[PDB]
Design a protein around this motif. Structure first.
Motif, PDB file in Angstrom:
ATOM      1  N   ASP A   1       7.686   4.110  -1.061  1.00  0.00           N
ATOM      2  CA  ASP A   1       7.285   4.211   0.329  1.00  0.00           C
ATOM      3  C   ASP A   1       5.904   3.592   0.499  1.00  0.00           C
ATOM      4  O   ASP A   1       4.952   4.020  -0.149  1.00  0.00           O
ATOM      5  CB  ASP A   1       7.314   5.673   0.798  1.00  0.00           C
TER       6      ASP A   1
ATOM      7  N   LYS B   1      -0.510  10.714  -1.098  1.00  0.00           N
ATOM      8  CA  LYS B   1      -0.304   9.592  -0.173  1.00  0.00           C
ATOM      9  C   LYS B   1      -0.298  10.108   1.251  1.00  0.00           C
ATOM     10  O   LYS B   1       0.394  11.092   1.562  1.00  0.00           O
ATOM     11  CB  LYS B   1       1.007   8.867  -0.467  1.00  0.00           C
TER      12      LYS B   1
ATOM     13  N   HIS C   1       0.844  -1.180   0.000  1.00  0.00           N
ATOM     14  CA  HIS C   1       0.000   0.000   0.000  1.00  0.00           C
ATOM     15  C   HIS C   1       0.881   1.232   0.000  1.00  0.00           C
ATOM     16  O   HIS C   1       1.364   1.656   1.047  1.00  0.00           O
ATOM     17  CB  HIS C   1      -0.893   0.029   1.238  1.00  0.00           C
ATOM     18  N   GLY C   2       1.120   1.811  -1.165  1.00  0.00           N
ATOM     19  CA  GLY C   2       2.012   2.954  -1.217  1.00  0.00           C
ATOM     20  C   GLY C   2       2.354   3.353  -2.645  1.00  0.00           C
ATOM     21  O   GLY C   2       1.726   2.881  -3.600  1.00  0.00           O
TER      22      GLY C   2
ATOM     23  N   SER D   1       3.218   0.605   3.025  1.00  0.00           N
ATOM     24  CA  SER D   1       2.934  -0.309   4.123  1.00  0.00           C
ATOM     25  C   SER D   1       2.744  -1.696   3.497  1.00  0.00           C
ATOM     26  O   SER D   1       1.921  -1.854   2.595  1.00  0.00           O
ATOM     27  CB  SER D   1       1.709   0.163   4.857  1.00  0.00           C
TER      28      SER D   1
ATOM     29  N   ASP E   1      -0.665   1.816   8.195  1.00  0.00           N
ATOM     30  CA  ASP E   1      -1.130   1.618   6.801  1.00  0.00           C
ATOM     31  C   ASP E   1      -1.086   2.958   6.095  1.00  0.00           C
ATOM     32  O   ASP E   1      -0.763   3.992   6.705  1.00  0.00           O
ATOM     33  CB  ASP E   1      -2.545   0.993   6.779  1.00  0.00           C
ATOM     34  N   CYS E   2      -1.414   2.955   4.805  1.00  0.00           N
ATOM     35  CA  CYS E   2      -1.366   4.184   4.004  1.00  0.00           C
ATOM     36  C   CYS E   2      -2.614   4.384   3.140  1.00  0.00           C
ATOM     37  O   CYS E   2      -3.142   3.437   2.587  1.00  0.00           O
ATOM     38  CB  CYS E   2      -0.150   4.199   3.065  1.00  0.00           C
TER      39      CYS E   2
ATOM     40  N   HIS F   1       6.369  -0.937   7.663  1.00  0.00           N
ATOM     41  CA  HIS F   1       6.586   0.156   6.710  1.00  0.00           C
ATOM     42  C   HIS F   1       7.891  -0.041   6.026  1.00  0.00           C
ATOM     43  O   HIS F   1       8.903  -0.298   6.691  1.00  0.00           O
ATOM     44  CB  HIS F   1       6.584   1.520   7.387  1.00  0.00           C
TER      45      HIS F   1
ATOM     46  N   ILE G   1      -8.059   4.620   7.855  1.00  0.00           N
ATOM     47  CA  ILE G   1      -6.710   4.134   7.671  1.00  0.00           C
ATOM     48  C   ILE G   1      -6.219   3.546   8.990  1.00  0.00           C
ATOM     49  O   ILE G   1      -6.117   4.242  10.001  1.00  0.00           O
ATOM     50  CB  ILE G   1      -5.741   5.278   7.178  1.00  0.00           C
TER      51      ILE G   1
ATOM     52  N   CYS H   1       0.436   8.434   5.006  1.00  0.00           N
ATOM     53  CA  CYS H   1       0.848   7.278   5.811  1.00  0.00           C
ATOM     54  C   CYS H   1       0.834   7.631   7.276  1.00  0.00           C
ATOM     55  O   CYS H   1       1.297   8.696   7.677  1.00  0.00           O
ATOM     56  CB  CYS H   1       2.253   6.796   5.410  1.00  0.00           C
TER      57      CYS H   1
ATOM     58  N   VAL I   1      -3.762   5.813  -0.309  1.00  0.00           N
ATOM     59  CA  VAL I   1      -3.112   5.953  -1.605  1.00  0.00           C
ATOM     60  C   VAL I   1      -4.093   6.435  -2.670  1.00  0.00           C
ATOM     61  O   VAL I   1      -5.163   5.857  -2.870  1.00  0.00           O
ATOM     62  CB  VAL I   1      -2.481   4.602  -2.072  1.00  0.00           C
TER      63      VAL I   1
END
Ligand SMILES: *[C@@H]1O[C@H](CO[C@H]2O[C@@H](C)[C@@H](O)[C@@H](O)[C@@H]2O)[C@@H](O[C@@H]2O[C@H](CO)[C@@H](O)[C@H](O)[C@H]2NC(C)=O)[C@H](O)[C@H]1NC(C)=O
Ligand SMILES: *[C@@H]1O[C@H](CO[C@H]2O[C@@H](C)[C@@H](O)[C@@H](O)[C@@H]2O)[C@@H](O[C@@H]2O[C@H](CO)[C@@H](O)[C@H](O)[C@H]2NC(C)=O)[C@H](O)[C@H]1NC(C)=O
Ligand SMILES: *[C@@H]1O[C@H](CO[C@H]2O[C@@H](C)[C@@H](O)[C@@H](O)[C@@H]2O)[C@@H](O[C@@H]2O[C@H](CO)[C@@H](O)[C@H](O)[C@H]2NC(C)=O)[C@H](O)[C@H]1NC(C)=O
Ligand SMILES: [K+]
Ligand SMILES: [K+]
Ligand SMILES: [K+]
Ligand code: NA
Lengths: 376, 376, 376
Positions: free
Chosen positions: C23, B149, B9-10, C25, B141-142, C264, B137, B151, B144
């Motif tokens: 970058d 973004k 996730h990013g 998760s 976690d992030c 992360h 979120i 985080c 996106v």
């Protein structure tokens, strides 16, 4: 329309307009130094001295001092005032021939402390040109200045609230962690069984077993002290080490020399154009205490009521803290409204001499209030 | 040759092609707002409204409701059907003269909940131009999107799985944490000693002591209830506070107003060229449940078996989740192969009415399955 | 004037002179692959293959093997050598008519392990052009090379030091966590009550109750084994799952397939100009052991004394580690001075065959020392 907020500790940057990033994992028990002359891209003869000093990680633990744990021997006597009546810790049955148990050969084996709060921090000093600023930065907080941001991110799982720390010797050097020290029920044989909370006075353990008249008395419960039982299986318990310890009333600070632990450091530098400080605001706060309830030295804690005056903004989202002598014990996030506000701050820790003040940032009220004693 | 994976996730970015970074430590119990007009470098008259709203940290705790803890008095009686036979909690010895113990003056003092799972989250809303998206979120976690973004990185150590939460009053406001609530052995005097798991029915504690016939009966074990023993040393236990509590069956959610806690927020914005979404893929998944075993409301948990169809890729590394009503209770990382797959997902939590569905991303099967009750 | 330090694992970069940032998760139980051809801004025909492989998170747990937990039945007998004298676990009262208790129908139900240390890691492999490097990266540490940095940041709270892990079957698959396994006092009915630490020999629990002569003997204490009491409330305990387990002496490693957990990952790449490696230094270290004290398999641990020779620098801030077979058990941060240094390293874990070596980075002394056994 405005919604000022200083709860964000950090910066907004344009990644094109930033000059240097340092990003690394640092041994917790290590310092770090960075020194560099910042020079213009061959364009000009103007340089800036950058000097960053990050100190070793410190732990600060708000505790309740529990006094001394004791070893002792459980003695059984038969009579027919009990001959053993002067013993502070005893247990008897009358047959109408008296059976008695008493503790003797008492010896303190260590000093015990209940963990109320754990916090880690590093002192961070930044010189940028003729600017020099030092701050104690909590783990998971950030140092913010016009040209330099330093963020510390980390996690440690060694100590927990509620753990009991035992120091056997003049224990700088180290101690043991107990996760099951007796509290609401202490039976002879438990860790924490025989305590003296202060100079005098024992808190005696229970003796759950039964007497029998045989006429020789017998007792059929456990006869081995908690100290001896723990020593017999000492490898079942977790040690920790310490360095440059500082005991104060109801607080212990030290540097953990465990070099297997690390935290994360990020340093961002902009040479020309200032960072956007995300907490910048024109709001002005005045503070005083109103009242307090609850206790120091307590896992339940206290509540400090603050009268907080807001001017120069219609509203202001911020934090009001309960602090004394530059240690803070609690914080409340609050959207203040212009004029007077009443804010309750829940805190834990401190000692009988603490005067808990209402604080905002590095500013505090002129006086603080004393909380009540625990364990009355 | 392809190896599609959506477990990341990013974003991938070119630091030259990014326009704004926000990086800060935020009070956990605080919201944060950012509003800016993104404008082209003096080149053009085209601006983009950016509006970010980050909500306060929420905790969600999957629990087993344990019912009510009671205070009571232990009464001793001598007889020679026991006169006290209607008492639910009792203990007797016959001499053939009957000695009996029974609990009475029972009163509920609080509601207890066993922690099964702890998760923290923040709701994050991002408007970029005419795009508006909100998502809950999870910590670590992030969020996106093509241009933004967000985080969240953090750690909290206040609650642990297995802890027992006690609420004394209509306890919004707060409660106590117990780390040693009795489970497999409950003796009179323990925290958790006298429970009523549901409307009726007591789970009675043991009385480990002995009777003596003296003819007056005596009992030589502990006579003080667990509630009284805990209250007598209440400062030994850890309180917590709550705000905007939401109890549902086997779940509690609230916002912790402890303002000493912080987490880390990073926001990255690219104005022109989209981020590379690291989880982007052409794979398509269909889902249904096959079977379930195990229990809701249980530290041991359940296992949901899913039939998962993969098309448009030879393989796909992803996660299949067990969820109901937009709460997820478990996830399994799996490399699916084209066609049909059988995937087992281990989960914990939920209640008797939960129908655990097989889910991928925000997509779920048409029905879910019920798990079995705990503590049968 | 110099103050060399290699305790910083990371890089200094100029954000204008960096080419790619990833970058995200990542699901803890998932691998991640990134493959890209780095190409010059349309300027030139020279490309660089980048290939990054991040493996699933692994947990490594240093433990003390406690042997097998047993179920059994408590039998009461009346006599007037006791008929039951060959039973290993027994309890008796003489009336002068002998009353006895003994355990029988013994059966091992599981294997227990005390957690000494928990560490998480991911194997990270980076190919940049013709450079290929793989390293096991601990959580909260960084992979550092000339052109690529990979940092892992995370937190997990599932296991704690002191917890006892129970495996019932040939338990790959999973086990239970016990937070209150008996140690200094084991009473019949406790989790951990009846243990066999090795092939033979039971560690018998206490029987805290009393006999009565009625002539038929009675015993008024608990008669239900710890295994049966735990099974009767099994949902009160926390399960965990495992995959690709590896037991070695006093150590367990596995991959936790809980896909709800994330960590992360940050990946920074510079194509042309090398990163500034923050730990770079000209200092040279030689190492050998001097002595050891303390124990393997112990929460108290051991201390390894190292003789460390520093050349090519006046001082050097670094870490000296206690390791064997590429597993490290302890580290000490130290500012060495030119010439000979004596450095004490506190460690925990290992087994009777471990030879703990003095190490710096990936370099170790030629021999290590054995620590003593625990629980003598
Ligand atoms: C935060 O919690 C405190 C703590 O008090 C609570 O503690 C729980 C463990 C539980 O026992 C609960 O019943 C108890 O109220 C709250 O402070 C308390 O508030 C009550 C009601 O006004 C007072 O009678 C108490 O004296 C007071 N105690 C203390 C130490 O302040 C508090 O209200 C709550 N909320 C906030 C914002 O702090
Ligand atoms: C993940 O663990 C579950 C839990 O079951 C295990 O729990 C441990 C605490 C221990 O007691 C162990 O003996 C036990 O098997 C596993 O599910 C179980 O699998 C067995 C064998 O197929 C079934 O008989 C059980 O009914 C089943 N229970 C549940 C609740 O599902 C599971 O196999 C394991 N692996 C995965 C991928 O989930
Ligand atoms: C780090 O701690 C160890 C552990 O020893 C301490 O353990 C505490 C739990 C407590 O019981 C305390 O009394 C005890 O000393 C220290 O090592 C010990 O040092 C003493 C004094 O030299 C020796 O007699 C012991 O044999 C030794 N034990 C071990 C296992 O090494 C150690 O000094 C301390 N500091 C460092 C830098 O490691
Ligand atoms: K007694
Ligand atoms: K009894
Ligand atoms: K006994
Ligand atoms: Na008895």
């Amino acid at each position: 329309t405005p919604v000022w907020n200083d709860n964000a500790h950090g910066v907004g940057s344009v990644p094109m307009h930033t000059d240097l990033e340092l990003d690394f994992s640092l041994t917790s028990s290590s310092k770090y130094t960075y020194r560099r002359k910042l020079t213009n891209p061959l364009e000009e003869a103007q340089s800036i001295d950058l000097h960053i000093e990050i100190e070793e990680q410190t732990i600060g633990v708000d505790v309740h001092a529990l006094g001394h744990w004791f070893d002792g021997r459980l003695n059984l006597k038969t009579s027919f005032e009990y001959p053993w009546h002067t013993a502070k810790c005893h247990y008897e049955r009358d047959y109408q021939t008296a059976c008695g148990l008493y503790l003797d050969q008492l010896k303190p084996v260590g000093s015990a402390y209940k963990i109320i709060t754990i916090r880690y921090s590093r002192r961070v000093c930044v010189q940028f040109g003729e600017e020099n600023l030092c701050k104690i930065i909590d783990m998971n907080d950030c140092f913010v200045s016009r040209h330099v941001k330093v963020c510390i991110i980390g996690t440690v799982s060694k100590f927990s609230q509620g753990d009991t720390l035992l120091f056997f010797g003049p224990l700088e050097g180290g101690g043991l962690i107990f996760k099951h020290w007796c509290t609401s029920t202490c039976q002879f044989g438990d860790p924490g069984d025989i305590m003296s909370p202060r100079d005098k006075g024992f808190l005696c353990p229970e003796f759950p077993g039964s007497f029998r008249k045989k006429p020789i008395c017998e007792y059929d419960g456990n006869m081995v002290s908690g100290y001896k039982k723990v020593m017999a299986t000492i490898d079942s318990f977790q040690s920790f080490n310490t360095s440059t310890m500082h005991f104060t009333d109801e607080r212990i600070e030290w540097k953990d020399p465990d070099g297997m632990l690390r935290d994360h450091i990020n340093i961002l530098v902009t040479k020309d154009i200032d960072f956007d400080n995300l907490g910048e605001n024109p709001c002005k706060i005045g503070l005083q205490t109103s009242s307090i309830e609850g206790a120091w030295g307590s896992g339940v804690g206290f509540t400090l009521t603050c009268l907080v005056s807001l001017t120069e903004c219609p509203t202001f989202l911020t934090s009001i803290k309960a602090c004394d002598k530059a240690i803070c014990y609690g914080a409340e996030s609050v959207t203040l409204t212009r004029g007077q506000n009443t804010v309750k701050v829940s805190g834990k820790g401190g000692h009988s001499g603490s005067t808990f003040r209402c604080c905002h940032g590095e500013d505090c009220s002129q006086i603080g209030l004393h909380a009540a004693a625990p364990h009355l």
